[PDB]
Amino acid sequence: HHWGYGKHNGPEHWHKDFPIAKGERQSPVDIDTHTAKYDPSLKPLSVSYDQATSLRILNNGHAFNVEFDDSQDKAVLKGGPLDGTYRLIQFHFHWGSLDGQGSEHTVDKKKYAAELHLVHWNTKYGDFGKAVQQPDGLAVLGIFLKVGSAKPGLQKVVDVLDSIKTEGKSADFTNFDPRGLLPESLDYWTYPGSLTTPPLLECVTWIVLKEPISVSSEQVLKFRKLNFNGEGEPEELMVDNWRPAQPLKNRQIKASFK
Ligand code: NA
Ligand SMILES: [Zn+2]
């Protein structure tokens, strides 16, 4: 793709090819914890990932995605602000060149080292491609990563990154259990937003968890060794693949907790 995260094709340029970049419900945003409204009508999230089937990990030149079999209700998200059942299709991360940046959402202007996005689509629309054209088509669970202790359940991912260093490489990636990426608490903020990469469609109910997970410096270091470029092209390290916070405009962030 022509878009990317550099000086000449990065997020401040995206609106020329994707005019929705300046839309009314763009993501990410800063979550102002004192202005977020506690909504006691929000239900607990229901995450059912015991039957998840991972298939493949791939470097798509802007992040790396772990892809799941979503041809049946095997790993689903329900409850919270959602209606209906949303199936997990892929997860990926955004991270920085240094530990003090990398998350897309911020919490009272605080940046975290990275942000994990678990992407799910509304099974009433039949496939992911139809779901992205609907205002309630996707639900993305966002989880912040801070640097501290290692996360053992992430190690299987960091160990295969060597095999998908450059854009377009993929590897088999089976029997990965995404339950090892979840914090203890499922308390969350939710708001209506968009994909944070092109095509930036406004089809996302965001569900951002309050509690970060900790990963080790050595674990996030290995993310920073991947490349944006394809094999044989000049080396450009895959770092700072985050979009800056966008205006909230006419939107309220709701919290599941006080
Ligand atoms: Na993608
Ligand atoms: Zn993302």
Write the layout of secondary structure elements.
Blueprint: H1 14-17, E1 30-31, E2 37-38, E3 45-48, E4 54-59, E5 64-68, E6 76-79, E7 86-95, E8 106-107, E9 114-122, H2 128-131, E10 138-147, H3 155-160, E11 170-172, E12 188-193, E13 204-209, E14 213-215, H4 217-223, E15 254-255
Parallel strand pairs: 1-8, 2-15, 10-13, 10-14
Antiparallel strand pairs: 3-6, 4-5, 4-11, 5-7, 6-7, 7-9, 9-10, 12-13, 12-15
This protein binds sodium ion and zinc ion.
Query: How many distinct domains?
Result: 1
The chain-level structural class is mainly beta
How would the global form be characterised?
Answer: globular
What would you report as the Rg, rounded to the nearest angstrom?
17 Å
Order of helices and strands: HEEEEEEEEEHEHEEEEHE
Count of DSSP strands: 15
Find the CATH superfamily.
Alpha carbonic anhydrase
User: What oligomeric arrangement do these chains adopt?
Assistant: monomer
Give the ligands present.
sodium ion, zinc ion
Helicity, in percent?
A: under 10%
* Sheet with most strands: 13 strands, mixed
Protein name: Carbonic anhydrase 2
Active site: 62 (proton donor/acceptor)
Site (Fine-tunes the proton-transfer properties of H-64): 5, 60, 65
Main location: cytoplasm
